[PDB]
A paper describes a structure:
The flavivirus envelope glycoproteins prM and E drive the assembly of icosahedral, spiky immature particles that bud across the membrane of the endoplasmic reticulum. The immature flavivirus particles that bud into the ER lumen display prM/E protomers in which the pr moiety binds at the domain II tip to cap the fusion loop, avoiding its insertion into the ER membrane. Maturation into infectious virions in the trans-Golgi network involves an acid-pH-driven rearrangement into smooth particles made of (prM/E)2 dimers exposing a furin site for prM cleavage into “pr” and “M”. The flavivirus particle’s life cycle includes three key steps: 1- budding into the neutral pH environment of the ER lumen; 2- transport across the trans-Golgi network (TGN), where the pH is mildly acidic and where the particles undergo a maturation step before exiting to the neutral pH extracellular environment;19,20 and 3- entry via receptor-mediated endocytosis into a target cell, where the mildly acidic endosomal pH triggers E-driven fusion of the viral envelope with the endosomal membrane. The fusogenic conformational change of E is irreversible, and the consecutive steps outlined above require a special particle maturation mechanism in order to avoid premature fusion-triggering in the acidic TGN during exocytosis.
We initially used a similar construct for TBEV prM/E, albeit with a different linker connecting the ectodomains. The single-chain TBEV prMe-linker-sE protein behaved as monomer in solution but crystallized as a dimer. Its X-ray structure also showed a disordered 150-loop and a partially ordered linker extending from the E N-terminus, but with pr still bound at the sE dimer interface. In short, in both the DENV2 and the TBEV structures, the presence of the artificial linker prevented ordering of the 150-loop. The difference was that the DENV2 prMe-linker-sE structure showed a monomer, while the TBEV counterpart is a dimer.
Residue numbers in the entry:
A (entry chain A), C (entry chain A): -2 to 13, 18 to 149, 159 to 189, 192 to 367, 370 to 395
B (entry chain D), D (entry chain D): 1 to 80
């Protein structure tokens, strides 16, 4: 290998002195090049919190039960049910036409009230967790970009500095700072059912807090705003039906279309987006191969011929049949100028080790790459 | 259908789908059950007044009515 | 009794010559008064069709299965699956980043395709039936508005005339005509589940035909437009997940809020609204009691004292202790004028029968009602 | 996990949740299964290419990879 992960990412930056200030975005990576120093790949691997605090939970499908209706005749005042002043109920007061044909002395509008008990169907809740800046962890990884190893530093708000040992390449120092409103960021999940849905979504707390659904805190007996999922039928003399507004999963998933899907790995809740600013100290970085002799120019073979890296750099792989380890002779000419070298190594000291990957920058136009006496025509766009 | 007298002086007829368009005897009166959406007894229930109709009056906008018996309620589940 | 149903309805008209042209609205009723003729209550009882034709059915919850993903490297053309040209599948073509780390010679975007089989979950269909003007039936009922019997006439487009016999009251002729676009009116139902929902709703066919859901005709193997309930995840090198958009019941019931709930009684599908225009012939109507002597003025008792009918008329009930049957003496004076009768009977020939209900119109102000020598003060608003 | 050779020369590894972060032997090669969302076998399945990584290369953006064996596919249900 030798740092091939960065060579694959879409968001790749090159930073080319002792310190270097970089911004590390989740899903991106940075390659640091420095004269007389090995190249380093640095990236923000994760931003997560273990066991974040739960927020309120929402009901997606109400379980409606024990519907009761009371009526009073014209002049006889309001119709009442005990369930009007109880928790876990949804009530509606209305008026019905009354007369001699339904036990009233007068013809007119009489009071009618219908109440229903409202609970949540099993496995039909939407849950949330909120982040806390004092408990977030951010993982920064460093790997030598040599082409022949990966180290991890974990940071909090309180622990901003770390020194990583890059084996034989010396030491690298990292001073990282984190940067939106974490206490206003919620990670939303739905209870699992037979259908396949994403793991979770990251939403703004104010949006999560406005969902038109019944809600409660874990452990509460009843649901608040349960009327959101109840519909009352037209009143008859003494009868008024109560209906369900149905399963809200489709409603919620439609509103979540385009919202970023987040990941949960055990007790780790991952932020979908974010960045960290680092100071990378290269003063203790040393090159490996200050003792190795030049590779025999005639013993190379193209394993993978020169190809576009996707980042306006050229990548290749060579096989070596001579004495190992050795420092690889690499150069490139502008077609028509065989004397001047126009190759700018991203892998600065390519070395064949006992059991090869070279990356270079080139000026636009017709060029010829040389890995020893192994040659290849290359046009830089 | 089954009948039960509550402690508050009320009477509760519990009916199922078989009881649709039947006439039952409650104390010294009779009640007519005409609810069309009844099923087997459960939590998914509806409970309301089974209104007493005075002698010489025709019932209006009711699917449960009584004669010669006061304070009657109907309850039915909607399962099955 | 004696025609007490009409006295209870909110929509009540009075029509006061041999023929009479009326409009009968569902939920409404008309009282016909005619000099030397008994009063009649006429109403449109129902507009229905037995066994209407089924329309397309919609899926509310997709059952997703056998998800397969195929990928190709940069330059290697499109990724394909057999399921792309099959029925009962949902497919999405996309591009994924590829390189040496996932078996491609080049770095770049490679083609990726994901396919899923899409069916409907059991009891998760929405069905429709469409009306046909050539098969609609409309039921008109007639009942003598006497206060001491109900007849039904069924009409089609082909059978517009009928003669009903009002027992001793003679005969009544009816010539009825029907009147929106029935072939563009759909009655929508959802399959029954554990929750309580209305029986059905009446919708416009063009609205029913635009529902953004998978659809099919009964008996078809697959669903059309099944992609409406599928969501594809972000593509990785060779893997792309496929998710469900969830149960659409809540989506559909939200759109049906305020839409009129319709009724199904066996094989009869009832229209929620509609009217019929009738010609009612009264030429063969005769009064009953041309032989009965006057009721004894002193043998009446108020069973129900004068009360507002709800339709700017006065209703009452009397008990009689003398010789039966007899014609009831009824009158009313404007307070200050004992000579002049200001009572306008809606029940024109009130008769006490062997095992009583009187309805009158009165001019505004202070009046006194007399049922024999039984009296009652009445202020007309 | 179970292995089966199809008539088209392909190989199908059928895995469950127990198989997460395991290495299996397929013909004269080995495959590493790293899918984290696996469950018991059913209709609610996912099937894709378990990509062969060339010698001296590190796998990138794959949760199933093989060495010294060609045309391998992974399939898993997501029930339980």
């Amino acid at each position: 290998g030798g740092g091939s992960r960065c060579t694959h990412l879409e968001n790749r930056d090159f930073v080319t002195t002792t310190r270097v200030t970089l911004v590390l975005e989740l899903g991106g990576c940075v390659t640091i090049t420095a004269e007389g120093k090995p190249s380093m790949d640095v990236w923000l691997d994760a931003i997560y919190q273990e066991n974040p605090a739960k927020t309120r939970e929402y009901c997606l499908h109400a379980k409606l039960s024990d519907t009761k209706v009371a009526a009073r005749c014209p002049t006889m005042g309001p119709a009442t049910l005990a369930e009007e002043h109880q928790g876990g109920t949804v009530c509606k007061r209305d008026q019905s036409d009354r007369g001699w044909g339904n036990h009233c002395g007068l013809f007119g509008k009489g009071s009618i009230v219908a109440c229903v008990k409202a609970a949540c169907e099993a496995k039909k809740k939407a849950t949330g967790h909120v982040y806390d800046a004092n408990k977030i962890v951010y993982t920064v990884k460093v790997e030598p970009h040599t082409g022949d190893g990966r180290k991890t530093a974990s940071f909090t708000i309180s622990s901003e500095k770390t020194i990583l040992t890059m084996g034989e390449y010396g030491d690298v120092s990292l001073l990282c700072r984190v940067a939106v409103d974490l206490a206003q960021t919620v990670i939303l999940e739905l209870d699992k059912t037979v259908e396949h849905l994403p793991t979770a979504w990251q939403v703004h707390r104010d949006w999560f807090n406005d969902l038109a659904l019944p809600w409660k805190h874990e452990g509460a007996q009843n649901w608040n705003n349960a009327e959101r999922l109840v519909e009352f039928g037209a009143p008859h003399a003494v009868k008024m039906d109560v209906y369900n507004l149905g399963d809200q999963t489709g409603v919620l998933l439609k509103a979540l279309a385009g919202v970023p899907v987040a990941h949960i790995e055990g007790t780790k809740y991952h932020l979908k987006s974010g960045h960290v600013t680092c100071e990378v100290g290269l003063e203790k970085l040393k090159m490996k191969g200050l003792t190795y002799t030049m590779c025999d120019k005639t013993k190379f073979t193209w394993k993978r011929a020169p190809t576009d890296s996707g980042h306006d750099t050229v990548v290749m792989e060579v096989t070596f049949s001579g004495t190992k380890p050795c420092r690889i002779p690499v150069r490139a000419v502008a077609h028509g100028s065989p004397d001047v070298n126009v190759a700018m190594l991203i892998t600065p000291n390519p070395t064949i080790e006992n059991n090869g990957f070279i990356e270079m920058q080139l000026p636009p136009g017709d060029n010829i790459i040389y890995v020893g006496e192994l040659s290849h025509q290359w046009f830089q766009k | 259908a089954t009948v039960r007298k509550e402690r508050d002086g009320s009477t509760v007829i519990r009916a199922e789908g078989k009881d649709a368009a039947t006439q039952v005897r409650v104390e010294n009166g009779t009640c007519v059950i005409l609810a069309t959406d009844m099923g087997s007894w459960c939590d998914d229930s509806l409970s309301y007044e089974c209104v007493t109709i005075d002698q010489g009056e025709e019932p209006v906008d009711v699917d449960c009515f009584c004669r010669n018996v006061d304070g009657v309620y109907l309850e039915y589940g909607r399962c099955g």
